[PDB]
Amino acid sequence: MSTENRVIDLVVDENVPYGLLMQFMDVDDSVYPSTSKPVDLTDFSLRGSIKSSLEDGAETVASFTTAIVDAAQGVASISLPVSAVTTIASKASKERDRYNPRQRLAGYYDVIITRTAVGSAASSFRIMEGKVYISDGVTQ
Amino acid sequence: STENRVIDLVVDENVPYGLLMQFMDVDDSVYPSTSKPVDLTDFSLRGSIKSSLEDGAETVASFTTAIVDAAQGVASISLPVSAVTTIASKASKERDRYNPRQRLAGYYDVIITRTAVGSAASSFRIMEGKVYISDGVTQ
Amino acid sequence: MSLQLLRNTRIFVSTVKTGHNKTNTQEILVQDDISWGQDSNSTDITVNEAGPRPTRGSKRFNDSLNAAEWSFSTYILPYKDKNTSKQIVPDYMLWHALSSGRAINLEGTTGAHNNATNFMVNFKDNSYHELAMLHIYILTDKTWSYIDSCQINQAEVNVDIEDIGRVTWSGNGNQLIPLDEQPFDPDQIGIDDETYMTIQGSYIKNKLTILKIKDMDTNKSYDIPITGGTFTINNNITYLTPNVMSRVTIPIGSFTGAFELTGSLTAYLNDKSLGSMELYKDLIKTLKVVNRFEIALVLGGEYDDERPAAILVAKQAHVNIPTIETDDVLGTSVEFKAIPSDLDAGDEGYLGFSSKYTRTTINNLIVNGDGATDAVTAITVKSAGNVTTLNRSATLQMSVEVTPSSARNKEVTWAITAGDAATINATGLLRADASKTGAVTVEATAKDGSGVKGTKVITVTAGG
Amino acid sequence: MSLQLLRNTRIFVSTVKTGHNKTNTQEILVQDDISWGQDSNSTDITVNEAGPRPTRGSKRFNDSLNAAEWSFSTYILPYKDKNTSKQIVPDYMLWHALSSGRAINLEGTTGAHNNATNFMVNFKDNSYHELAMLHIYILTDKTWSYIDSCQINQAEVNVDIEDIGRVTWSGNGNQLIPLDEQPFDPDQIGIDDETYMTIQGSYIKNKLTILKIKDMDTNKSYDIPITGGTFTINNNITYLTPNVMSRVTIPIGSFTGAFELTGSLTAYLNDKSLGSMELYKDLIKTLKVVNRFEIALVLGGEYDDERPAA
Amino acid sequence: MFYSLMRESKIVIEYDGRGYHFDALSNYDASTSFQEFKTLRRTIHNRTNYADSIINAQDPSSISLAINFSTTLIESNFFDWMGFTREGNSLFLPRNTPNIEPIMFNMYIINHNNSCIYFENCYVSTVDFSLDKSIPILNVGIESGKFSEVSTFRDGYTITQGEVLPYSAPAVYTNSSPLPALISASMSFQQQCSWREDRNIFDINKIYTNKRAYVNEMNASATLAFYYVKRLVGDKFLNLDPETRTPLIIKNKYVSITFPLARISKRLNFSDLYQVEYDVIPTADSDPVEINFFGERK
Amino acid sequence: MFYSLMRESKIVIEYDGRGYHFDALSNYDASTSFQEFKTLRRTIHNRTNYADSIINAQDPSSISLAINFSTTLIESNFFDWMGFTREGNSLFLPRNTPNIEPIMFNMYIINHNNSCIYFENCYVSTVDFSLDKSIPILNVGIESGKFSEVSTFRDGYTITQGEVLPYSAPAVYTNSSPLPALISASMSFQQQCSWREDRNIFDINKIYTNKRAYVNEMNASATLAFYYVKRLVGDKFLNLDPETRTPLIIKNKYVSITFPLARISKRLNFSDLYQVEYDVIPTADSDPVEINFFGERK
Amino acid sequence: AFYYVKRLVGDKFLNLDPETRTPLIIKNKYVSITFPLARISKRLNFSDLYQVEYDVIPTADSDPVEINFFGERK
């Protein structure tokens, strides 16, 4: 009955690899209390992309590298290497904000988890969405 | 709590600078928070002082990292008096509002790093902020 | 032993109280309506008894001094100086202290900064509790005086047709101080005859006033011949004075209020297409809480040959619901206010002054923000190899040609508008498929906001 | 492509928004001082910080529309019409909407009702929260417009000697609506030359103004030659508009206030019997909390032969 | 950065999995706060100056909305959620409170840039509107247990309030005999619930939020203001005597609150013009109080 | 029908069978109300929503009159009715309260068309007037037990207040030495009675009205406001020390309140111009407090 | 007293959650009150422009609260 929070804004650090890991857990409310079992990520793949705008025809700033850490514990990690961080930093907006000159808007990102197989239905699902920001660094 | 990486350094003119970081790992599960210090193995810190955040900015100076007493977690970041003079040379002539002795010299950030402790380059930024030169009178 | 006349007053604007040179102080050509002064507050303590033989006596105490008031009017007189060859208005530091709170830097890109094409003022850097600080120096005949630590409160500009373009300045100072000795030689700092000739060569006449208004929510440009108007740049600066019972006090510091860029524009009702009547009817029919209008008031007119002009641009403006002003000839009033996209973004509007505005220069000032940066004027989209059609399952990577050839932003976006028989990417590589037997279109628009259209009707068929 | 002049304005008063005929709409002969319009309210939201580098930006919202204001002046022009042979004033529905809140019925005995002798207006039936409802139609040159659901707020009558008898109307409407198409042919509904001649035959001159004042507590009629005066019929009508934060709003309904019939009469002091001096001295000598006077202001004068009068 | 303007907001009430976006909102007021346990342990050893304060609970929020009447009558759901039984477009005050706990619902206060404040476990505790010579408006008062900040939300695109109803003068009747010289008819309805605080030792080192509540009572009330008017000497209909049972109805063109039997108490004020004031409550055995909602044309 | 205007009214006080029409009345305020017993019998069987309210008593009325001083001095009867003993035109504050119960009288508030409100079992409970630089006026406060509506009444055609007394500046003396720099002399007199509620089980199903009352105490008080004035350094006459017993008189051209021995407490305010404030009450063994009423020419 | 300002969606630095211990300083050009560790409670008002209100007190084990008095030039 409560609300979800699909909109998440990420903040990356320039010159540093960014690593985010998501855990999918099955839940239920019954006579016995909340029973949680990790979701088995088999045939589950992720794919995320970043563009500088929502409107059609937006320039693709970069794309995220997807991997699954532990299927039994239902843990998947979505991250990008340091070179991708530099690429996004180059393509970010040059407009600074006072009280914190570090952060600059980089664009919008989405993540779809999908399960593709002959017996599996062609079902996709946008797990998250939001904007990507950059914390500019001076080292390196 | 939350995040407090942003702290500004005020270095003194004509005086060598040295900062002593007692790395620590507090956990608030138990009401008296655990005072366990992190153990400094396979750790290196890197920090450069660069005027402004724009790309291609000239490197005003570079921090000199010291790792001592790894067991109890403490560490030192420092730079010689010559580095202090080089920083003070390029500092802006406009003085800070709250202190008429400080002048903005640039930006900085130090980055911890694990080098293949588990075949992973787990390097993340520790702190950040602005470096301020405080004009001296002795010399 | 002498009387002082107002006609012999000379006003100098300074940023320094010592070391006065030609880059810190210049004379400001003022008019008859110049005024300055400082008022004082007092109080009367009176005993209020009720019995017979009551005490009837008062007593006065000086308790505080008010902030000094000054005001004067000047002509908008853009010109180019021989030293730097960059268009500059003589009272440029007034514009800077109005626009931004940083040190003056005409080479920069915020506040009052000039160029080889035009003099520009933008309010992108006015987020300060104490804007650039001036010192008005007043010279009446022989005696000197000045107001200490002034701040430009506002600048009134009245669009009064059959009159010359003029701006009225107002502000406040900490204290008016009379000076017995000459601060600087007014003969040297004051403007000489050569620059006076150069200035009087360029005058802005309020009669030749064209206005450019466009509804950003509907893309409808209106043709409104103005009758009279005014716009203000207001800072709402309030001066703080301490309260001390034992000694009189003068203001110590100030704090800028809310930056307002409002206006009011009167015009007659026109039944012609895209006239005043259409704008009034659209505004009273929509009845919207918020409006997005682009307003570009161009004092001095637009012409192919070089003419002086002063331009106010409001990118995202807010227009009040108009009212009909019943006179011998029916009219209306278009009261507007330039609001920013975000509160802490500034950029509510900007101004461009120059004695050399060709129509293209003001157009690219309006659409690009600078008179020197060229802007695209027209586009015809080009296919890959002068191709006129396409068949099923065939690519068409279309290109673009733009005019002028020196526009700063030569890029375009891509879109499909009419028909559903193809798809286009960011680069422009149009792609189709089978079962596409309809006529589809392709469009392109520039990223500088010029409003240029690139269209082509490609006759995609089912193939041979 | 045309400019519109105020001199070509023509005003029609209607009780219906459709089916306009000669019994629902008539032209009202207005003067130079005619005016109409509608104002809008707004608001500025400004951030008021105290620190260094404060935010200096504002924002405007249209929040509501005010009630439409209209006003015009007309000459008091009684005459008899050929169709009914009953004395009637051309702007009679204005008088009715001022007087009573019921449907117009000139055959009745309340509000604006006429006769073979005179046209009469009494306020015996004005106990209504919403008086008779009009619709002012404005024709400037070629374009049309009208104010929706008007109400007669007041009627100013200024007794200005060496001038003609005139009445100034004021009121409010829900909304001013511009009409692109012609509602009704103004040539037919507008007054023709015959009734214009009949009207201009009868004019009321404020100079020939006799006043009849009598103290009902003492039975003392006074002879007061007037110098200048005015009387008002006021309804104190207030228009209610709803407050909605998301959308602009126009007034929705109204409510009549307290009906006031005041006046002011200036005259010179006369030492003659039953003059101004006697009235002034009696009034300042009695010093009574309440007075019972009979006042009959007769514009246009009284004469043995037939004369126009209000 | 992003400032939050009240005028640029949207209030959506989430009930039964459907979003009731309440447009035609004149003004709303809300606040959020936390409860602290601040004790100062001054001892003979150390007469300290620094307190021991820990935040352990969320103070319940008190949200008040002012909503204009609308043609689609979404605002009657506030009576529906507050406990009234429904038949057609008329709301009955039940003889007995139906359930122990009130009807709980969530509420969103949307703003630009995915900003939102999420009030949960809300219940309608007060609804009162004054039928007067100004446009009627009902001020509802809801109390929340838990407030939160969320990124995505529920926005009532379809379920919304229509155009505001035009003003119409109120009139109060006894059966069908009008009561003369009305000034201001104010109606009040309440669901005086109470939070059941169940903060226990298992919630130590955690923030507690109220979750469950019970209804102490429901009631319908009205205060009528008249001018002291008498038509006869020693009149029987209009006087100051109390009326144990009398049928009353406060009628409008769009709403009519009916008391099948009413207990009226009168109060005379010797003001500039004498005013009498009624205090109308339903009797013990009176039939359920009616509240009709007529959109247009009754 | 007939509306009731305050300006068109006449207040007549009925004492001893004679009507004291108190003209020169600046303003009066009054209210009438009833007492209810409203209980809600919510049970586990039926958690009802309808209360059990019965009107069983009339709440005592609190009528306040503001009366200008007059040349015929009818207003001194308020001191006479409140308990002061009379000798000539001077009213004494008795050493002991004479009777247990106050002096009861009825009061009418007449209006046009035979309309009236009849307050019964009234007593004067407060009288205070401020001698100041404005026209003096004494606000009397009476409490009623029973209010009623009557057709015919008592109207004081003859017994009426004359012309208002012209203003005269107040002056306060000690013996015959004037006290300088007076601002506002305010005098207060009270008869702090209390209603004896005797509502019993024989009054069930009936409306009860208070009938009998007893005097808790009478007192005379005055608050004097001066400007802090000193004539000498270390002055003895004018200072801030309390004065256990000192003869005081607040004198006017038409009234003079005398304290044969007074207990004065002083209070200094550091305002724009320093002001001292006295608190004058008669001592334990002081002679009766005098209140003289001079019509004209003393 | 602040204005309710957020820079990100789901921001961590600026929110309504209580802060058990955080170093705070209310600084001026002539005075600076320092709380080495502070207990902050937040309160949001849905006024014309949303305002948040803090309630800053020093913690139990916080170092002494500083009050500096700078005459001129710090």
From Swiss-Prot, chain A:
Subunit structure: Homododecamer. Interacts with baseplate tube protein p140.
GO CC entries: virus tail, fiber
Key words of the record: Late protein, Viral tail fiber protein, Viral tail protein, Virion
Presence of keyword Transport: no
Localization per Swiss-Prot or TrEMBL: Virion
Pfam families: LtfC
Protein's name in the database: Collar protein p132
Domain of life: Viruses
Coiled coil region boundaries: none
UniProt key word Isomerase: no
General function of this protein: Forms the collar, into which the side tail fiber protein pb1 is anchored.
From Swiss-Prot, chain C:
Predominant localisation class: virion
InterPro entries reported for this sequence: Big_2, Invasin/intimin_cell_adhesion
Sorted UniProt keywords: Late protein, Viral genome ejection through host cell envelope, Viral long flexible tail ejection system, Viral penetration into host cytoplasm, Viral tail protein, Viral tail tube protein, Virion, Virus entry into host cell
Domain spans labelled BIG2: 375-453
Region described as Disordered: spans on this chain: 40-59
Subcellular location: Virion
Gene Ontology biological-process annotations: symbiont genome ejection through host cell envelope, long flexible tail mechanism; viral release from host cell by cytolysis
Cellular component, GO annotation: virus tail; virus tail, tube
Reported function: Polymerizes to form the tail tube of the phage. Tail tube protein polymerization takes place around the tape measure protein (TMP-pb2) and is probably directed by chaperone proteins. The tail tube is involved in viral genome delivery during ejection.
Assembly description: Homotrimer. The tail tube is made of 40 stacked trimeric rings. Interacts with baseplate tube protein p140.
Record note on domains: The C-terminus possesses an Ig-like fold of the Big-2 family.
Protein name per the record: Tail tube protein pb6
Curated annotation (Swiss-Prot), chain G:
Subcellular location: Virion
Cystine bridges: none
Coiled-coil segments: none
Record keyword Disulfide bond present: no
Keyword Metal-binding: no
GO CC aspect terms: virus tail
Functional description taken from the UniProt entry: Forms the simplified baseplate, together with the p132 collar protein ring and the cone (DTP-pb9 and BHP-pb3).
Designated name of the protein: Baseplate tube protein p140
